Amino acid sequence: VCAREPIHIPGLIQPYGVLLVIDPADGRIVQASTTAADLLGVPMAALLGMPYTQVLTLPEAQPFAVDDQPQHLMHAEVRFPQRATPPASAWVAAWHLYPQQWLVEMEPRDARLVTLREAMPLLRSVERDPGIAEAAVRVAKGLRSLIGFDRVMIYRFDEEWNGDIIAEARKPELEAYLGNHYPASDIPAQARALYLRNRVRQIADVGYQPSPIQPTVHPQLGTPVDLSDVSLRSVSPVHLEYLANMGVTATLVASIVVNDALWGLISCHHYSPHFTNHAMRDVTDAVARTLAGRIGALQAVARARLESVLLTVREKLITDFNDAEHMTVELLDDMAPDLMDVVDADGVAIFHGNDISRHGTTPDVAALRRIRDHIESEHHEALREDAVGALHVDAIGEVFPELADLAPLAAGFIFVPLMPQSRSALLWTRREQIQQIKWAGNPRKSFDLWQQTVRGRARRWSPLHLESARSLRVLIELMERKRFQQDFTLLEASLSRLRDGVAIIERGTANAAHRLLFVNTAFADVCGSDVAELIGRELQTLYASDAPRANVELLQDALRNGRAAYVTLPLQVSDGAPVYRQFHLEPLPSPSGVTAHWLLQLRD
Amino acid sequence: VCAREPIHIPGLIQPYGVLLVIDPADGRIVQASTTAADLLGVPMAALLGMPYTQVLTLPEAQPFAVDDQPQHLMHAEVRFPQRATPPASAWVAAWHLYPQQWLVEMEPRDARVTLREAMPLLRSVERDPGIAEAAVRVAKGLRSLIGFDRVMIYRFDEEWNGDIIAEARKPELEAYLGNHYPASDIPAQARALYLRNRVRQIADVGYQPSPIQPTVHPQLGTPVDLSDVSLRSVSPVHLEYLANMGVTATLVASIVVNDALWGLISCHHYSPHFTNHAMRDVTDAVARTLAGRIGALQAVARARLESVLLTVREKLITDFNDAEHMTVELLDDMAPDLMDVVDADGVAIFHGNDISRHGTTPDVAALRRIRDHIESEHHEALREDAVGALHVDAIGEVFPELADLAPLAAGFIFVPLMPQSRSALLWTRREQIQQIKWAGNFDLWQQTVRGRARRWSPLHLESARSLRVLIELMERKRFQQDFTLLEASLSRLRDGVAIIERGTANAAHRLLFVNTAFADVCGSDVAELIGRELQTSDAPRANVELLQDALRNGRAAYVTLPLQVSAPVYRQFHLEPLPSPSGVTAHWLLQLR
Ligand SMILES: */C=C/C1=C(C)C(=O)N/C1=C\C1=NC(=C\c2[nH]c(/C=C3\NC(=O)C(C=C)=C3C)c(C)c2CCC(=O)O)/C(CCC(=O)O)=C1C
Ligand SMILES: */C=C/C1=C(C)C(=O)N/C1=C\C1=NC(=C\c2[nH]c(/C=C3\NC(=O)C(C=C)=C3C)c(C)c2CCC(=O)O)/C(CCC(=O)O)=C1C
Structure with missing residues (x-):
């Protein structure tokens, strides 16, 4: 309304x-x-x-x-x-x-009170200043001495458009508003939009x-x-009512616009009436512009510094993981410090099918299992879809009310893989962090500060850290690829040391032929020519071109239709000796039930 | 030097x-x-x-x-x-x-209404969009303000060479707009000082x-x-250069963006001119506001882009993990976005001897020529020094042998960085010819540059490093495909085979895998037999000792032994050690026909 x-x-x-x-x-x-x-x-x-x-x-x-x-x-x-x-x-x-x-x-x-030249030392100092905090206060104090205003503060808008007074300079007689949180509704969006337009805005006397x-x-x-x-x-009478309610008589606000967005506001209060001449509004504009400037630069610089140190640590993890072939306890014990650091987590749990490697400040092994189950659940399949690259919570007791507890150690987490992929998984945890929200009242009578204590919520998952998490998604497929590769080579080795003489055949197309995928040494010996020089060979190559039409037809039929066949056939004998073996062809089960491969056992 | x-x-x-x-x-x-x-x-x-x-x-x-x-x-x-x-x-x-x-x-x-008079210009750059529009507003604005014969905005490129992006002059004169100058013209020595002393001024060249x-x-x-x-x-070197271009007075404000030197505000007076402190503090102010705007717009647009890339990156990751069969249509529907995520003109997907060419990419044989050159022993230096992915901005410089190809693959992004093979991804950017307006390298000279693509955005490079997962994804999905194939193959055999995991004397010698032909001779089904000890006297001590002794050292054994059937049943137990990377037996293959 x-x-x-x-x-x-x-x-x-x-x-x-x-x-x-x-x-x-x-x-x-x-x-x-x-x-x-x-x-x-x-x-x-x-x-x-x-x-x-x-x-x-x-x-x-x-x-x-x-x-x-x-x-x-x-x-x-x-x-x-x-x-x-x-x-x-x-x-x-x-x-x-x-x-x-x-x-x-x-x-x-x-008139009354080179006032622009006199502003320069303050500006020149905030420009040199490190940290937004130090700047904010320097401006609050600096502008408080420069202009008259009984109370001068720096109001910072948070993510949900609510405000917090980060800095304040005022007459020691006045009760400090530093640390005050105000709702977003105190400054409506319609208002905020204008503050990007008219950047310096003063009320000479509330109730004019x-x-x-x-x-x-x-x-x-x-x-x-x-x-x-x-x-x-x-100005709106709504704001004027609110102002009159807090006992203020005069205003002057300057917009802190950083990267074309209203980051904050410089808010000045006079408890007696005060008109700030065109000369001073241009001075406060100058100090607002310099602050906006510095805060945005400091943001930019430090964002970049962090991104790089995360990348160097991300790479260290990726490499050391790809290096070792067997995931030992010490690999994961030396991995864990950094695996936590890359996302600024308090704990990290690495899952590998029924097993867990918990590190840092993380809930018990049974509790971690309770979490994973709840995440991989059918009811909570909505969250996994709507989630970006990884599933993350800022308060566990809200998204998963069943897991209301656990919050003291796992108030927030980052779960990857997002798919119910299982086997390999990664759970980053952030323990509970209690928050006191120093309010200003809860049109209103204001004054009275209500301190809302918030339990069950961890520190907000940094967007920088979330993409840093999404980046390490590779450690999961890495674990998995390395596991499948381990069992594959095992079975490929097993197959190759056999006596029966077997070959796997990949079904071709209407323009592609039926080729051999894998062949063991026992099979490649009956064909004379070695294993590596038979892989990718057409099946028609293998048997001789002097074979009976009746027998080859039986085999070709089974290939054409994806059926099985047991036919005695001569081989392509380079030497001469007539070598005939019983060609056992068997279709291998496909998910579509449509033959994709055949197994060829050779024993007459 | x-x-x-x-x-x-x-x-x-x-x-x-x-x-x-x-x-x-x-x-x-x-x-x-x-x-x-x-x-x-x-x-x-x-x-x-x-x-x-x-x-x-x-x-x-x-x-x-x-x-x-x-x-x-x-x-x-x-x-x-x-x-x-x-x-x-x-x-x-x-x-x-x-x-x-x-x-x-x-x-x-x-002396000779200035700092207050500067405010309208500042307040305007403060809100105009695009660096281009700002640069010119400052060039024109500052020309009206201080009143120099020509005010130009010099932007430093990646290699520290400078290009005049905006210029405001007297109706007369020769326009320097678009002119490129070498890095040698402004030494590193000098550049370092313009972060220190922000606004620099020469009253009369040849003082x-x-x-x-x-x-x-x-x-x-x-x-x-x-x-x-x-x-x-100032250095007589620069003074000589200045006198050579007929300039009599100078004023150079530094465009320092995020504590780094982005450019310079260069002012020329072809008659002598002393800019008092008053004015130098005004040009400093306009330089600071410009720096400010250029850095904000950079920041805004960096953020806008990061998000659209992430949405597209996620779309690719998901659709890849969804489909199991690496089909042609899979890759054909993947390719538009797989290209977009890195702003490539072409993309080639490699999967062991096979290639899936998309967009504007060189021929299949040429792509192979590139991959080989990258995976080479001589070029193993580049892969180590490279970050998460290997990338070139001009192939003819990095790979001189691949000097050609440049019309379609002038720049590329190769992942994986390791000679890992099987799965690989090559992103290409075709040649983009550049006309370079020079200072005389003292009149008109235009350098046309072939063999170089558009600079690989650092944002797009981390966007590439992000998709590194599609490779291990392909690989895991490939090994999983062949594994199930081989697991199915062995299980449909007639010979009766089992894989045995070596127990490190803490755990016994257990069965890892068993086929149906083996589980039938033992009566009890496959899924119950997996994870059981090979210990299955009903057998001679001589024969079991032969089998045990082989298992003990990690050696092979061929011994006829009885079994446990619900007729006794005897089979030739062919145990064979399977090759290990350490060469120390970890598994055995047991076939018995
Ligand atoms: C209808 C919702 C509102 C409630 C509730 C309320 O208290 N005000 C409401 C509406 C408007 N507020 C407007 C402007 C405005 N509000 C603030 C808030 C603060 N200013 C302070 O100094 C402090 C504490 C010290 C608080 C919490 C500010 C700063 C502003 C803008 C300041 C200015 O430019 O003078 C507003 C728009 C009025 C306008 O046209 O300027 C409305 C409708
Ligand atoms: C030794 C190599 C040099 C060559 C060749 C040359 O021409 N100059 C060389 C050296 C130095 N230049 C220094 C300062 C300097 N150089 C430039 C160049 C330009 N001025 C312009 O107006 C344009 C184009 C329109 C160009 C390309 C400028 C502007 C400056 C001053 C930088 C500033 O004031 O911010 C220099 C250092 C001298 C010093 O001490 O200031 C050297 C050694």
């Missing part, structure tokens, strides 16, 4: 200044705020439709036509040629030039009298005035 | 300003530039050894002792009392405070270099390291 409000078209202005909407056609004022008549001279009635040029007193810079991209002119000096000695305070005006309309927003110079724009909708277009870039835009 | 020159210790200053080296212990001047005596009242002789307090007075800020980290003070007002009416103009000075020495560098204020009178410190014996001094005399 709240996330749906205009806020960019309230048709109201903060009374401290004046707004005018001018038709870029020739120069006539089409819309103006009720405050315009008081300071401009000509009252409301005749001021509307009047050329801006009648009140043309822009000494520094003038507006101009715009093609497509709206150009925004800075705050420069402005006068009034209607009244003799117009106000008491000095006035400055900024332009918002659009292809459809123009907008001029004026406010007092304020909103000066409305006289022709609410454009008299010639029929559309309301989209402020969005106007600094004198009237 | 050009970079061998010092450049940070020339012992010379740009004449426009004055330098002084003060003993932070004494408060006295130890070294000073020949220009110091002319500005300051006291001539060189008595100015050397004189306490700094006397000759100059600092109203805004004063120097101080430093523990370890050198502290630098900004440009603030300075007055010289040791002379009656000495201000040729207005003078401003900056400090460089070190634990061993102090350095003060002064220059005129110059008279004012030397520091005591060249080496009189008490330390070491020269003055001017790496942070703005009035540092």
Whole structure:
């Protein structure tokens, strides 16, 4: 209900200044705020439709036509040629030039307090600063000394769009808000979007009298005035209520936009009214921009540093695994430190059909089995599909309520393979980590901080670490390939040391012939020519080309139709001696039941 | 080797300003530039050894002792009392405070609404998309701001050579946009310094270099390291080059992105021009905002890409693990994405003597020629030094023998890195011709480069390393296929065979596998007999001893022995040791017909 409000078209202005909407056609004022008549001279009635040029007193810079991209002119000096000695305070005006309309927003110079040159030492220091933490506080303190504001804080948005005050500088008399968590709903998405547009936004006095724009909708277009870039835009009464509720009288926020995303906000509070002149808003913009800059650089650098150390450790594991042929206890005991490190796990369990190799801080062997079963279950087959490369939980008691316990050691885990593939598996665990969420209340009466203690949840699985996990998926197929390769060579060796003389035949196609896949030494000896020089040979090669049509037909039939045949046939005898053997051909069971291979035993 | 020159210790200053080296212990001047005596009242002789307090007075800020980290003070007002009416103009000075020495560098204020006036440009680059659009906005923006005859954005490529991506000039002149320059033009020596001193400036090419009178410190014996001094005399090598291109004044701001040098803001004035501190701090600001934007957009788009690759990587992994039969349609439906995951033009899947060519890839015989050359003994050096996969950006350089093929396989990604064979994957990127606009390697020269593909993205290379699993996946699935084949083969035999696992004297000699023909002679079925000890007296001690003794050493035995049948039944027990990698018998084959 709240996330749906205009806020960019309230048709109201903060009374401290004046707004005018001018038709870029020739120069006539089409819309103006009720405050315009008081300071401009000509009252409301005749001021509307009047050329801006009648009140043309822009000494520094003038507006101009715009093609497509709206150009925004800075705050420069402005006068009034209607009244003799117009106000008491000095006035400055900024332009918002659009292809459809123009907008001029004026406010007092304020003067009083090179203030941009004076900002440079603070900027120059945050630039050099390591860690976001150190920067945040330097800005909080620095800006608190630079600008007046009784309370200045750094509000950081978390993943779920909730906020946390990471830094704060305030008058020792005020009760510190450092460490406070606020819901996402406190700053709705509609709001957040504007903070990427207008980056520095100040409220001079909470509970001001909103000066409305006289022709609410454009008299010639029929559309309301989209402020969005106007600094004198009237903020939502929802926020104003909330502000008044917390006893604040003045505001100034600066958007911490990092990688085109609103990372955080600089939030300033004055418990007495305060207007920050165009000069200071450009200073806070500067310090916001430098902070956004540094926080994003530090993010970038350290993300890259981590990615590399993980890769070097990932490779170390992959190689040492491919090297050793037998998975011993010491291999896995020397593997485990790093196998844990690569994902920042507290424990790791390696499974290999009925066996488990538990390492670090992991639940008991029986408990790990209870987990694996629950994961590989039919009911939980939904999770495995929706999961990316690996299955992972941040709180076990939520995804698998049956495994509500175990959470003290396995609150979070990473399971791979994602398929119910079995034999080889890997379980990375992260033990429970209790969290105190220092709230601000649970429109509301606020103040009172409620400290929500959260059990059964581990540390959030880093996306960096999750792709680092998905990367080691290879250790599973590696284990498996190495196992099948072990039993295969065993059986290939077994087969080759036989006396009966056997060959395996791969069924061909309509353009491919029936070839030999495997042949033992006992078979290759009856054919004279060695084993390696018979593999990949057509079956017609093997028997002589002087054989009876009746006998070969019987065999060819069994090959053509995938049937079995027992036929005595002469062999392709290079020497001469007539050698005849009983050709036992037997179809081997296929999953489709459609013959793919045959076994050929030779004994007459 | 050009970079061998010092450049940070020339012992010379740009004449426009004055330098002084003060003993932070004494408060006295130890070294000073020949220009110091002319500005300051006291001539060189008595100015050397004189306490700094006397000759100059600092109203805004004063120097101080430093523990370890050198502290630098900004440009603030300075007055010289040791002379009656000495201000040729207005003078401003900056400090460089070190634990061993102090350095003060002064220059005129110059004057002529700037830092506030810079803000609209910054705030605009701050939000425009693409590095291209930013580069030009800065080029144009900074030209209007400082007012140099030409402002150009120089981007360093992978091999440290530079290319002008954007340029703003006077309507007249010759455009340098698109021009490529060598790495030799800006030595590593120099580049390192532009991370140190951010904004560098030459007021007049062919100035008279004012030397520091005591060249080496009189008490330390070491020269003055001017790496942070703005009035540092630049290499005559570069000055010659500058004079050769007709430029009279320069200004070069460093585009440092994620603490690394990404580019340079190069400004040329074909008439002399001194850019005061005020402006250098403005160009620094615009350089920092550009760096900022270029690094953000890099970051955003890196993230966007990583995700689309992951979604496609997962699609491949799953569909591969699903299908059991490595069919033609399997690979034909796999290939579009198998190519996409690495942004290849072609992909070849190898499976022992066989190849599955896809996209724009060389002929089957040519692919074999490539694989052989990779798996070679001579090229075993590359495979070790390579990360997770072997990759080339120009095959003709890495594999000179494979100089051709380049039209279709100019670049490739080969996995597995080991001479593992059977399963392999080769990703290809065809040749991409590049027109290189040179500086004269002093007029127009365009170099057309053949035999090189598009640079293998580091993101795509880790995306390749990620699919390493498809190889072990193919392999596991292949061994599993032949295993079941052989397990089925042996079980349909008539001779009656069993495989025996050697018990390491802790465990007995047990049966690993048994066929139906063997399990029938023993009556009881196959699945019950697996895992049972060979111990199955009803037999002569002489005959069993022969069998036991063979098993004992790991030797073979052919002995006729009775059995346990529900008629006694005797069979010739042919035990044969199976080859082990260690050569130490681990299994035996037992056939009995
Ligand atoms: C309807 C939901 C809302 C609840 C509940 C609420 O308290 N406010 C709600 C709506 C809006 N908030 C808007 C802006 C806004 N809210 C905050 C929140 C904080 N500011 C603080 O200083 C602190 C603590 C010190 C908190 C928790 C901020 C910072 C802002 C924007 C700041 C600014 O630019 O002045 C908002 C939009 C109003 C607007 O148009 O600016 C709405 C609708
Ligand atoms: C010894 C090899 C050199 C050749 C050949 C050459 O032409 N110069 C060589 C050496 C040095 N160059 C140094 C600085 C420097 N070089 C360039 C080159 C360019 N300037 C331009 O405007 C363009 C194109 C439009 C090019 C390619 C620049 C800009 C700079 C200054 C870097 C900066 O100020 O940030 C140099 C070091 C001198 C120094 O001490 O500053 C050497 C030795």
